[PDB]
Design an enzyme around this catalytic site. Structure first.
Site, PDB file in Angstrom:
ATOM      1  N   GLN A  19       0.797  -1.216   0.000  1.00 45.58           N
ATOM      2  CA  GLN A  19       0.000   0.000   0.000  1.00 45.58           C
ATOM      3  C   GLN A  19       0.843   1.286   0.000  1.00 45.58           C
ATOM      4  OE1 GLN A  19      -1.719  -1.040   4.108  1.00 45.58           O
ATOM      5  NE2 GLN A  19      -1.672   1.213   4.159  1.00 45.58           N
ATOM      6  N   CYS A  25      -5.361   0.796   3.764  1.00 46.41           N
ATOM      7  CA  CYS A  25      -5.432  -0.649   4.088  1.00 46.41           C
ATOM      8  C   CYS A  25      -6.845  -1.199   3.848  1.00 46.41           C
ATOM      9  CB  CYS A  25      -5.040  -0.906   5.546  1.00 46.41           C
ATOM     10  SG  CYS A  25      -6.160  -0.148   6.748  1.00 46.41           S
ATOM     11  N   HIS A 159      -5.952  -1.308  11.501  1.00 44.65           N
ATOM     12  CA  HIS A 159      -5.378  -1.766  10.229  1.00 44.65           C
ATOM     13  C   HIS A 159      -6.207  -2.957   9.730  1.00 44.65           C
ATOM     14  CE1 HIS A 159      -2.211  -2.355   7.255  1.00 44.65           C
ATOM     15  NE2 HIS A 159      -1.996  -3.595   7.665  1.00 44.65           N
ATOM     16  N   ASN A 175      -1.222  -9.403   4.577  1.00 44.44           N
ATOM     17  CA  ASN A 175      -1.027  -7.981   4.852  1.00 44.44           C
ATOM     18  C   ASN A 175      -0.694  -7.253   3.558  1.00 44.44           C
ATOM     19  OD1 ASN A 175      -0.846  -5.619   6.362  1.00 44.44           O
ATOM     20  ND2 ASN A 175       1.062  -6.207   7.423  1.00 44.44           N
TER      21      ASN A 175
HETATM   22  C1  E64 Z   1      -5.208   1.470   7.634  1.00 45.03           C
HETATM   23  C2  E64 Z   1      -3.820   1.506   7.018  1.00 45.03           C
HETATM   24  O1  E64 Z   1      -3.678   2.023   5.893  1.00 45.03           O
HETATM   25  O2  E64 Z   1      -2.885   0.954   7.636  1.00 45.03           O
HETATM   26  C3  E64 Z   1      -6.023   2.732   7.360  1.00 45.03           C
HETATM   27  O3  E64 Z   1      -5.414   3.632   8.274  1.00 45.03           O
HETATM   28  C4  E64 Z   1      -7.467   2.493   7.716  1.00 45.03           C
HETATM   29  O4  E64 Z   1      -8.350   2.480   6.866  1.00 45.03           O
HETATM   30  N1  E64 Z   1      -7.747   2.239   8.990  1.00 45.03           N
HETATM   31  C5  E64 Z   1      -9.117   1.999   9.439  1.00 45.03           C
HETATM   32  C6  E64 Z   1      -8.988   0.866  10.465  1.00 45.03           C
HETATM   33  C7  E64 Z   1     -10.275   0.149  10.855  1.00 45.03           C
HETATM   34  C8  E64 Z   1      -9.935  -0.836  11.976  1.00 45.03           C
HETATM   35  C9  E64 Z   1     -10.937  -0.585   9.676  1.00 45.03           C
HETATM   36  C10 E64 Z   1      -9.670   3.258  10.046  1.00 45.03           C
HETATM   37  O5  E64 Z   1      -9.021   3.877  10.886  1.00 45.03           O
HETATM   38  N2  E64 Z   1     -10.864   3.674   9.612  1.00 45.03           N
HETATM   39  C11 E64 Z   1     -11.611   4.854  10.046  1.00 45.03           C
HETATM   40  C12 E64 Z   1     -11.069   5.980   9.183  1.00 45.03           C
HETATM   41  C13 E64 Z   1     -11.695   7.320   9.564  1.00 45.03           C
HETATM   42  C14 E64 Z   1     -10.811   8.394   8.927  1.00 45.03           C
HETATM   43  N3  E64 Z   1     -11.491   9.685   8.985  1.00 45.03           N
HETATM   44  C15 E64 Z   1     -11.103  10.777   8.327  1.00 45.03           C
HETATM   45  N4  E64 Z   1     -11.782  11.919   8.450  1.00 45.03           N
HETATM   46  N5  E64 Z   1     -10.027  10.731   7.540  1.00 45.03           N
END
Ligand code: E64
Length: 213
Positions: A19, A25, A159, A175
């Protein structure tokens, strides 16, 4: 169900991706889940566009994070193009879905595994790859090289990754940090944690695409 399963050995998993710096992710785990069910029900292994989700899936935030559930709903509503016709740029751009060449994969719905239930997740992985979540920010997780990972890691999930198999003592996970991390890009996370959420929060939030034969 079998004591072990490995979707890579059934031809339902594409090569490992990287990525890069982009917080995308959520596009990688969801695409890996879609690629998996698509192979299972159609017989074809396709490489699908993370970039389409990054640009076009409106309820997520591109490289600033997103929601695997909503990515899977997008695929069930709009379908998704092949990677080779909508390649990964690691930056959000205008949605170009309507201009992308080539075929589309369309799913029919989205399912959710009952959370904090190891057996329920295992039962689902026996059927298809699953988009799951882990806490990946810890140095032990970041520095993982191989074998069965038990921690140290907390349960503050951050993640999205794809479960593509299991064995008696592990869940096998694809991953999106390239082949240079872990076991050619994979990690085995221990089963049988004391945390209700499992090791590294692996049981916290698991979703999967549905598609009929
Ligand atoms: C994960 C990565 O690229 O490593 C990426 O940060 C991601 O999408 N993380 C998710 C994780 C969840 C457990 C699925 C996440 O944090 N999602 C919520 C994103 C909210 C972001 N909000 C704004 N305003 N950017």
């Amino acid at each position: 169900i079998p004591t072990s399963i490995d979707w890579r050995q059934k031809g339902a998993v594409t090569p490992v991706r990287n990525q890069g710096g982009c917080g995308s992710c959520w596009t990688f785990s969801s695409v890996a889940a879609v690629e998996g069910i698509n192979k299972i029900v159609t017989g074809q292994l396709l490489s699908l566009s993370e970039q389409e989700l990054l640009d076009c899936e409106r309820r997520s935030y591109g490289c600033r994070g997103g929601f695997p559930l909503y990515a899977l709903q997008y695929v069930a509503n709009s379908g998704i193009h092949l990677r080779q016709y909508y390649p990964y740029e690691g930056v959000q751009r205008q949605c170009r879905a309507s201009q992308a060449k080539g075929p589309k994969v369309k799913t029919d719905g989205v399912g959710r595994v009952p959370r904090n239930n190891e057996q329920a997740l295992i039962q689902r992985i026996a059927i298809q790859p699953v988009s799951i979540v882990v806490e990946a920010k810890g140095r032990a997780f970041q520095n993982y090289r191989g074998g069965i990972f038990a921690g140290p890691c907390g349960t503050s999930i951050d993640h999205a990754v794809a479960a593509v198999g299991y064995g008696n003592d592990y869940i096998l996970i694809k991953n999106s940090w390239g082949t240079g991390w872990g076991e050619g890009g994979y990690i085995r996370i221990k089963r049988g944690s004391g945390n209700p959420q499992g090791a590294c929060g692996v049981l916290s939030d698991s979703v999967f695409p549905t598609k009929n034969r």
